Amino acid sequence: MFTGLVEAIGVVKDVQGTIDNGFAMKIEAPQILDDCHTGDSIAVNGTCLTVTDFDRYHFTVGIAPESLRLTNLGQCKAGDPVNLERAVLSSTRMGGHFVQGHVDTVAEIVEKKQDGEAIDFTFRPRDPFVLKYIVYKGYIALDGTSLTITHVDDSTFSIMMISYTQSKVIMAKKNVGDLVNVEVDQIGKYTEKLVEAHIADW
Ligand SMILES: O=C(O)CCc1nc2c(=O)[nH]c(=O)[nH]c2n(C[C@H](O)[C@H](O)[C@H](O)CO)c1=O
Ligand SMILES: O=C(O)CCc1nc2c(=O)[nH]c(=O)[nH]c2n(C[C@H](O)[C@H](O)[C@H](O)CO)c1=O
Numbered sequence: 001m002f003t004g005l006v007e008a009i010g011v012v013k014d015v016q017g018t019i020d021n022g023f024a025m026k027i028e029a030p031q032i033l034d035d036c037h038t039g040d041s042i043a044v045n046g047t048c049l050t051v052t053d054f055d056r057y058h059f060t061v062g063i064a065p066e067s068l069r070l071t072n073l074g075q076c077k078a079g080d081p082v083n084l085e086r087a088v089l090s091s092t093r094m095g096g097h098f099v100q101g102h103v104d105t106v107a108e109i110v111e112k113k114q115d116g117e118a119i120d121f122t123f124r125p126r127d128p129f130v131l132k133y134i135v136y137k138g139y140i141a142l143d144g145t146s147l148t149i150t151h152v153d154d155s156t157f158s159i160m161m162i163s164y165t166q167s168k169v170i171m172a173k174k175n176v177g178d179l180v181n182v183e184v185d186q187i188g189k190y191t192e193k194l195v196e197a198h199i200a201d202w
């Protein structure tokens with residue numbers, strides 16, 4: 001479980017494996033390894049992954065084919081920066097929201113323009129149906145970043161990235177064409193089943 005408040009930006013140091021069988025990945029991130037333990041859950045670009053080994057400077061993870069299929073981790077190369085956030089089990093969320101780290105799909109950046117001190121991003125999800133769980137002013141996690149929806153229609157959604165965030169996440173420097181991990185606010189899927197189980201009586 002996470003908050004979507006990215007703690008640091010690590011750097012991929014080694015990637016081995018294949019798209020069909022899985023990746024073994026090594027990440028440099030001393031900033032968040034002071035309290036590491038094998039088995040811990042760490043979100044890499046919003047993808048919850050299990051620590052398989054670590055030291056004061058690096059930690060490794062095993063990435064399953066399905067994780068690589070639904071996220072941008074399949075494109076990872078040594079040298080790439082990634083958003084990182086350590087797990088936390090808390091029933092409270094005063095900052096960010098309830099991010100599970102279970103990515104729904106990827107979205108392509110289709111527009112990026114400056115609006116004052118903020119950056120206006122527009123994304124096109126590979127799986128349009130996730131848009132049914134996205135609403136104006138609602139939450140969403142992009143590459144593990146908790147953000148506020150500023151616009152949404154039948155094929156895209158947008159967010160505004162403020163100055164404070166631009167220096168904390170990899171999104172700031174991504175461009176049109178790049179992919180980001182999308183995790184819609186889980187509550188939406190919950191209310192969907194609620195109405196379904198509801199009219200399941202009507
Ligand atoms: O909660 C736990 O105890 C398990 C942690 C965990 N680990 C991995 C992993 O190590 N490798 C993985 O490849 N996946 C893990 N996952 C699932 C992963 O996040 C998911 O496939 C993507 O987000 C796309 O939806 C995990 O949930
Ligand atoms: O809790 C709320 O109602 C606000 C949600 C929220 N929105 C944004 C945003 O829209 N743009 C943003 O640029 N940031 C938002 N943030 C903060 C952002 O996640 C954080 O700076 C990074 O992850 C690094 O820790 C938000 O928390």
Ligand SMILES: [Hg+2]
Pocket residue numbers: 001041048049100101102
């Ligand atoms: Hg998880």
